[PDB]
């Protein structure tokens, strides 16, 4: 499905951010990476690199570097009346016994 | 934030995009090599334009940080190759002299084809029919008429580009801060920061010259037995105190004396161990070698390799369409892709190929944790040792009778083993003397022992104290014969082989002295031997991060220079050398008057 001949340079990856993140955070920041002491002054060429890289994905990848569909599911536990059930089910009635 | 803390994070950013553009380049140099097509070419022309383009740029980026307050040290060793000047610290005039008198020596050599033999309409071609007639032939007129027009004319059209090349190359490694570019080459070897083991450039000099001293006597001997099997066929031509021409040394440099073995047996009537027949005759097509290879290869302890690997490398002939090179080559794409280039024959001699082919494809998968400027060996000559003790694990009679391609009634005695031995010793030991001198000769060339008025003198009395042999025809300064080597006109390191044999022996008898075999070393076997595995994977995977001074005890327990286990490998062949070479005098010297 995904990875295409050409270059999948459409899924871009993060490599630098000036601190560590918090679990279920989302950062969409492309801004510029200050690596030198010196400011940048806008989009500069030394020492301020971008942050977002891509991916670049192929077909022809071995298993480490292709291209993984991965979905996360998380339950919470909050004390609220709760929404999601599972799906408890019956068997068939009877008549007339004890 | 100091010059490393930012350093690191800049090579990172590098690591990506030079991994990108490699992965890119080497999928067209895949295509290229598999598919001969103009399309391929204008992408051989795109790819390392811009991968040419981007190294420049980023080693320019990389100019500005600076290698001394840096304290890591692989962020040390990248960063100094990323600030290697190259071609770039000359002029412009002169960088493009220097890259066309490069091209136009490689198209000198590649086209070089000799006319002079009767009308010119017979022009006999290099590659196929040079090599070939003088392979297999008996004729001292027709060798040395064939020696003299391709030294000739090779030497004729290359001395003065040869000039300019050779102070070109001095004048720009003076201007890299080096001495030599000799010196630069034994730059590559370059190990400093590391506090008991260290080393150094001009090591290099010394590093070959008092092993050798300590390799020149068996090699005497074997020098010695040939000659003593060439004035059988070679009668009035020969004698044992002046040995031989150089002209009959196998092939055209005296590289290869494999040439030479059946005119050197060491008895005729029981031929060589030979399998193409039991190969044949069960069918084993061309995967089929494959899948033997990574069984053996798993029952080292080596990882499986991906499918990936199996559904891409072409394992085939290319056919009459879709026109391909038939090299062994082990391509390492990048991104977990490694692929296999080879056109598959029936043979013994394609069995070893194979097995050396995807030893280095099991030495590339180990290090591709590293990061991309440590995705190589930490010398040179790190791959070809692992190739080939890979092929030698395959070439011993014991894995043939493993792997079902022998009779179980066949039997090993001594006379198999010596003649494996010397087989062996035409393919070891035939490289090395020629290694050894071309590469002091290329360093006291280049570094300026040698002056520009005699190159030529000085290379036929050289040659006489370690190759031993006689100039065929008595030869002036004009030529231009030793830049006629493909190593030489195409500006390629030589010492890589030396480096090759010296260290693979090392780690032959120190994996089969760790696999509990009894035995002599010539039958040493990884057979069902995972102990071994993993010790030869803690050094396949470490790479370009530990140095290679380091890296070589932590398999073998040594840190310098070693000729012990090449001794130990061939003692059996030296004892009976000794024995039989008994009637026939020993030594070469310059007492043949021509």
């Known amino acids: ?21 918090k679990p279920f955070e989302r950062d969409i920041s492309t801004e510029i990476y200050q690596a030198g002491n010196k400011p940048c002054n806008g989009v500069a060429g030394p020492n301020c690199y971008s942050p977002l890289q891509s991916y670049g994905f192929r077909p022809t990848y071995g298993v480490g570097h292709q291209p993984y569909r991965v979905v996360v599911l998380s339950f919470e536990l909050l004390h609220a009346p709760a929404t999601v059930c599972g799906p408890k089910k019956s068997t068939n009635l009877v008549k007339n016994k004890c | 934030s100091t010059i490393e803390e930012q350093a690191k994070t800049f090579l990172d950013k590098f690591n990506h995009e030079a991994e990108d553009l490699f992965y890119q380049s080497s999928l067209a140099s895949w295509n290229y090599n598999t598919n001969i097509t103009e399309e391929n070419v204008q992408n051989m022309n795109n790819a390392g334009d811009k991968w040419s383009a981007f190294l420049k740029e980023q080693s320019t980026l990389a100019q500005m940080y600076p290698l001394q307050e840096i304290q890591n040290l692989t962020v040390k060793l990248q960063l100094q190759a990323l600030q290697q000047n190259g071609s770039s610290v000359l002029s412009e005039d002169k960088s493009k002299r220097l890259n066309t008198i490069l ?345 300026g022992e040698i002056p520009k008025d005699q190159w030529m003198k000085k290379w036929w009395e050289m040659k006489r104290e370690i190759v031993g042999v006689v100039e065929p025809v008595p030869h002036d300064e004009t030529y231009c014969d030793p830049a006629s080597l493909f190593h030489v006109s195409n500006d390629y390191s030589f010492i890589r082989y030396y480096t090759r044999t010296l260290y693979q022996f090392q780690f032959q008898e120190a994996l089969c002295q760790a696999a509990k075999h009894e035995g002599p070393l010539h039958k040493c076997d990884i057979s069902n031997s995972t102990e071994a595995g993993q010790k030869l994977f803690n050094m396949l995977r470490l790479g370009k991060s530990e140095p290679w001074t380091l890296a070589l005890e932590n398999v073998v327990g040594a840190k310098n220079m070693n000729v012990r286990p090449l001794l130990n490998y061939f003692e059996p062949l030296f004892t009976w050398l000794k024995d039989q070479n008994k009637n026939s005098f020993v030594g070469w010297s310059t007492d043949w008057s021509p």
């Open chain 1, 1 to 21: 499905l995904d990875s295409k001949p050409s270059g999948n340079y459409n899924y871009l990856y993060r490599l630098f951010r000036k601190s560590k993140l």
């Open chain 2, 103 to 447: 091209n136009t020596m490689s198209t000198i050599y590649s086209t070089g084809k000799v006319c002079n033999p009767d009308n010119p309409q017979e022009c006999l071609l290099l590659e196929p029919g040079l090599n070939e007639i003088m392979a297999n032939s008996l004729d001292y007129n027709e060798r040395l008429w064939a020696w003299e027009s391709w030294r000739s004319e090779v030497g004729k059209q290359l001395r003065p580009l040869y000039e300019e090349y050779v102070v070109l190359k001095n004048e720009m490694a003076r201007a890299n801060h080096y001495e030599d570019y000799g010196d630069y080459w034994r730059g590559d070897y370059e190990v400093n920061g590391v506090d008991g083991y260290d080393y150094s450039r001009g090591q290099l000099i010394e590093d070959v010259e008092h092993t050798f001293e300590e390799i020149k006597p068996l090699y005497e001997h074997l020098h010695a037995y040939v000659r003593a099997k060439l004035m059988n066929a070679y009668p009035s031509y020969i004698s044992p105190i002046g040995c031989l021409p150089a002209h009959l040394l196998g092939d055209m440099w005296g590289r290869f004396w494999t040439n030479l073995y059946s005119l050197t047996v060491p008895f005729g009537q029981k031929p060589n161990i030979d399998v193409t027949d039991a190969m044949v005759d069960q069918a084993w097509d061309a995967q089929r070698i494959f899948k033997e290879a990574e069984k053996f290869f798993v029952s080292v302890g080596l990882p499986n390799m991906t499918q990936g690997f199996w559904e891409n490398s072409m394992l085939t002939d290319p056919g009459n369409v879709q026109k391909a090179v038939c090299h062994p080559t082990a391509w390492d794409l990048g991104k977990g892709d490694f692929r296999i280039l080879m056109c598959t024959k029936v043979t013994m001699d394609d069995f070893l190929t194979a097995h050396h082919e995807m030893g280095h494809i099991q030495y590339d998968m180990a290090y591709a944790a590293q990061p991309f400027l440590l995705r190589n060996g930490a010398n040179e000559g790190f791959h070809e040792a692992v190739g080939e003790i890979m092929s030698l694990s395959a070439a011993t009679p014991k894995h043939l009778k493993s792997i079902g391609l022998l009779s179980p009634d066949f039997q090993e005695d001594n006379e198999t083993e010596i003649n494996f031995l010397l087989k062996q010793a035409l393919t070891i030991v035939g490289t090395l003397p020629f290694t050894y001198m071309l590469e002091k000769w290329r360093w006291m060339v280049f570094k």
